[PDB]
Design a binder for this molecule. Sequence first.
Ligand SMILES: Nc1nc2c(ncn2[C@@H]2O[C@H](COP(=O)(O)OP(=O)(O)OP(=O)(O)O)[C@@H](O)[C@H]2O)c(=O)[nH]1
Ligand SMILES: Nc1nc2c(ncn2[C@@H]2O[C@H](COP(=O)(O)OP(=O)(O)OP(=O)(O)O)[C@@H](O)[C@H]2O)c(=O)[nH]1
Ligand SMILES: [Mg+2]
Ligand SMILES: [Mg+2]
Lengths: 438, 341, 191, 431
Amino acid sequence: MRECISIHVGQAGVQIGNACWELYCLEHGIQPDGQMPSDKTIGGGDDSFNTFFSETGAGKHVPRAVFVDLEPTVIDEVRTGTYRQLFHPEQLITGKEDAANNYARGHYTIGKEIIDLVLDRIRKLADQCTGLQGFLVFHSFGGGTGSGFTSLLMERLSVDYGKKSKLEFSIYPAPQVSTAVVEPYNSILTTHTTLEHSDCAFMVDNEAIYDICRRNLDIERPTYTNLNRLISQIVSSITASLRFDGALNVDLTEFQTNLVPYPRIHFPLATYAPVISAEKAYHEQLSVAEITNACFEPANQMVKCDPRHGKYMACCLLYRGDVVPKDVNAAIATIKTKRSIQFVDWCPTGFKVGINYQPPTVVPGGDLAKVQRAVCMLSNTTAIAEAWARLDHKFDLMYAKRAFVHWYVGEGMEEGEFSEAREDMAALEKDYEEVGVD
Amino acid sequence: YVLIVTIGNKPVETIGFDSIMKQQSQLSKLQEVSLRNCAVSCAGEKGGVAEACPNIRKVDLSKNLLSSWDEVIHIADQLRHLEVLNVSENKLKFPSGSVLTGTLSVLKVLVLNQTGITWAEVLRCVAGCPGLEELYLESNNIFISERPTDVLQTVKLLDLSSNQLIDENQLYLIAHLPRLEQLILSDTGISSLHFPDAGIGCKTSMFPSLKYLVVNDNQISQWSFFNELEKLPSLRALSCLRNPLTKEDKEAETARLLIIASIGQLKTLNKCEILPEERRRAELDYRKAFGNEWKQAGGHKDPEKNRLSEEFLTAHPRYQFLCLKYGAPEDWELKTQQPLM
Amino acid sequence: ESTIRHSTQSLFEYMKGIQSDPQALGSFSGTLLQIFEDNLLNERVSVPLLKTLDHVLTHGCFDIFTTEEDHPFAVKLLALCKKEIKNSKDIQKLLSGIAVFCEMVQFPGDVRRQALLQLCLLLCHRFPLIRKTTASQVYETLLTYSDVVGADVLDEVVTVLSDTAWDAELAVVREQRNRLCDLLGVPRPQL
Amino acid sequence: MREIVHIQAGQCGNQIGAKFWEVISDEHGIDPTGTYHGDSDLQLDRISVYYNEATGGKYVPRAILVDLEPGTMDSVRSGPFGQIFRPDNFVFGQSGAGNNWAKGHYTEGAELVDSVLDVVRKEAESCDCLQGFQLTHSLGGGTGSGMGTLLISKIREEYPDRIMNTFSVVPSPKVSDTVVEPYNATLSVHQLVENTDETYCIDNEALYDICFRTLKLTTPTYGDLNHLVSATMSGVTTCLRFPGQLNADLRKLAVNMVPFPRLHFFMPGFAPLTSRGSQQYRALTVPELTQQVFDAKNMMAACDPRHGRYLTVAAVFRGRMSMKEVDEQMLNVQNKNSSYFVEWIPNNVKTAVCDIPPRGLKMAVTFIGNSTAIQELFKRISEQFTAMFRRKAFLHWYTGEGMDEMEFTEAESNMNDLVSEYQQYQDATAE
Ligand SMILES: Nc1nc2c(ncn2[C@@H]2O[C@H](COP(=O)(O)OP(=O)(O)OP(=O)(O)O)[C@@H](O)[C@H]2O)c(=O)[nH]1
Ligand SMILES: Nc1nc2c(ncn2[C@@H]2O[C@H](COP(=O)(O)OP(=O)(O)OP(=O)(O)O)[C@@H](O)[C@H]2O)c(=O)[nH]1
Ligand SMILES: [Mg+2]
Ligand SMILES: [Mg+2]
């Protein structure tokens, strides 16, 4: 077996990791204090949950996570939370100054006096693992800290841990849920600084998840808490491939070979179904075909795009719960007869399907109901490039008058970094269209 | 459980299918069975199901050919570890109280949606399962003519949606329940609910432990329902979406803050936590809205000059509470906008 | 502000010397109209020119052209202004137009009546601020020039422009507009 | 816990700082002895931003007062609240700079600049995490004009990662008849542009005209202007001392309100306008306050906000008004079809709502915008700076201390370039 370490960064990152760990504990049955009455061993090596959690002699389960934040406002609440005895104090690192929505800070001003300590803490967890696969980064492009500090840590690790995979779960900023006016600069800087430090990266449109929570879940004003509970489901469905004894994308290296054909292109679209509310629990029973067909709905997609107007390079379907291959064959045939999608003839990868005998789970009194089946579709299509087009519009307009640019150059940054980052974005956009040439 | 294609220009790579096929073949380890649209009429020879699948936690007998309730009771007897059950979309014929007890001694969930069951049969069918928590009864046209006595005691959840034959008279019968934490009433046609057994400020013994309440898709057009809801001893949560008052318009938000003002123990509304600032803003808006009405029906800052009619006390019983929380509205706060020439 | 304050004072000092000579004033007005015609539908020179015309008319520079009915200069000026105020949406450009239309009522003849009609078209605009500004400018012009409306009807026009909320719904403002038109002799507009 | 170090220099600077501290102490509920006696828990959740928690539950201010002349020092030491300021935070000499900028920045004010750095460094060592320094002085004089610039230039070299905010008080011929004021103002602005991220301009002519017309006071003294200055200062620093949804720190506020490096001068204001003595007379509402925040009469500078573009807009409300009531009012004034719509109240404005109201008033409002009209404050000093430079009047005093015409022409060119950039940006496309 092989272990894994999740490195969370920023406010959004730390808020998403707590919910993910809570969902994992509710699924595997881990108690708040860290006691698995079903486990019949004291140490890890023969079970299956040892990839994410770590066992000790006293039966305590210490989640393999490295939470690092600059503002202690959120870490103080995360420490005194319900799972105070779960996470180790050494894993939680806090700073003394906030970036205040700035990348040149989270990277050079506030990222220099914290990086020398983050590595010493990550080494303590890396030495305990006999075979580490890679890293599971959780941050957001909007937040200045979550972007700058994450990019600094990523490249810092590229030197030491070079022969290790790298993953990401960023959150694409939206105009409605915007905390900074410099969101476009930080995003275009972090996408260019770590375009080579990420083997695979997942983007979460704040608009798509908000619309999903407002329509599907039927919520008036979905708060960050509700948006984090919904993303936890997708995170668990994605990590089930490595947590359980499955047979599809069991290792982080398999993600770069079955989803990321081109090293440069590493932004695969993801979708998860169904999305039933708690009130309408036993209202309707959707079979595998319905949930598989709902994946092709722009409203249900995690990012606002139009895959219909684009080719497909790699596609991976993952079923969870009561699902039989006989029923999955019906959906596979319907995808071809009813629906129709083209494919890139120059792409090596193709279509893959997998099933896992693990039913879903929801938090007591939550927003989502305990459905009987779940489906997760990961498709790498060029349509996602549209999401990168609008992002370049705002940045370009702002840098046309060079507003809020002096605040970055005067914090350990050069004026040429912006030109380099948008020259890289232009090249990526051009390659996105060149890959989908008839 | 005991038993190529190309999309566009590429093949489908089904991997791990053999593992799932081998795991599902073991009938002696199926912790969850689902037979939707599988034609299940009878249970078969007794003793076989108890030996082939002696461990079952959840069953989904929805959309089957179950004609009689005895066929379901037979399967429920062999399944000792039956926790969750669902027999929706079945025109079963229940007996006149002949179902013996002990068949469902560990049934925590029971869904009976779309079954044509009546209130007289629900009590007879929930006779052999006192530890029943969830009990769904949606789309049944049930008429609450009787009331529980020795059954339906630990019913933590009671769903009665898609039933346009429920009113306050029928709710009073199922109001003396001891453990009633949830009572869904979506699309029930209800429009008014009062508590004559309690006065202004005093609580009511009906629905004491009613924590979460749902009343979506109803004719809720009066603020008399929200005003009556305050009498409930406990009511931390409420959903009132898609209604004549809380419509999808832009000004509908103005009604939201009103609800938070009509209830004091409302910590969440429509799955949205009400932070202290939100409650303060709602209370301030509610106090500023009826500022003119509070003075029209008598009222002054000095306790000496004060006389509120019964109308203002029954329509706004919580106004006096805010009067002491944020003082009384002065003469300058009652002029937020006026025309000019 | 300071630049405009200085330029206006410097221009008035020069205009005071060419105020009696009709040839100089005529040449200046012709050059101004030519500049206006050249930079038409231009938001770089049209707004400044319209703003300067307001001050030029308020100071009383074109006082010799007021002793003649149907002056070609004031006719072409009003024609160009109507062109520049055609569908005007922005409120910055509408303010200067309203000011010019109210500072042009001084010229008697067909320019006095027609110009007044324009004011009516601005009393029932699409925004209440425009209506209020037009009403205020009309009230100010009625007090400035007294020979524009007779004394017998001036009282009614003054009373109608005072106790009337010009920032209300158009359903009630149209009645006041029609009443003011019936008193000022302006023909009833037509949608 | 973000702390801020407040520094005061010059007679006018110290007089303004003392009044501002007294105001923010009376508003927070702190008796002149040192203990706390307020009646609200919100007056302590952010008291550490400007008060150190010493032994015995006392709150020690953080005001570092410096003055070459031993005048205002003794007055502040024996003031209504003189017993609050630490006693070794007072740094003074005997003879000042004699209304010469080359004296309080090179020969005299650079003689106590070393004791100032030791004091400001001893005060910051106790803080857990410093955010940014602060200074309150007047462009007129030598100890306010030269000492402030010297300290700003000396602190930026040792703390480049700290925000630098000032409260320059531009003089006016009406308040003072000194003739060596234009040079001191020009040389101060020359240094306040290349080593300052934010500068709140409080022109004296504006306050003089306000006291002459609005307040209708007989002979407006320095106290009337100091009261308004302290009121504006307390109204500006409302988010940095009280909770709220808009948790805009100093760096975040400077980044969101100052898009350009050189352009950073604001036009602070405050409403309603009051005076000393009585105050309770009329209770204002939210509409009236919004209509008055954006009037050039409520501004503390001789500039017309309407005449000029709008770089960044911001407003802070104080009283029982709700951010929901404020948003309703801020979304109908940026619309033409809306009634009582204003053309000078711009769009994308920042807005705040406070609970604790000011002293002697139940509802108030503060405006912190940056309009191009501020250029008028820079041109008025330019003319007076040129007419006196061609004749080389009072230039021997500057050339004898060490200065030269090079610095004068450099400051003149910098001011001209700033005015040109302001005029160019004033004519910009809205969309
Ligand atoms: N999905 C999601 N987005 C979040 C969350 N918290 C913040 N965001 C978004 O992320 C961006 C701001 O990032 P933050 O995490 O607040 O920034 P940070 O990493 O703390 O760094 P600073 O700039 O110093 O505050 C905005 O687009 C927010 O809307 C969260 O919990 N979930
Ligand atoms: N508003 C206001 N302006 C003041 C005050 N005191 C002085 N001024 C103005 O500031 C200028 C004088 O500067 P001061 O602060 O007195 O001088 P200084 O900084 O101590 O410098 P030296 O004269 O060199 O000792 C003149 O323009 C005064 O009108 C005051 O209390 N309030
Ligand atoms: Mg943060
Ligand atoms: Mg002095």
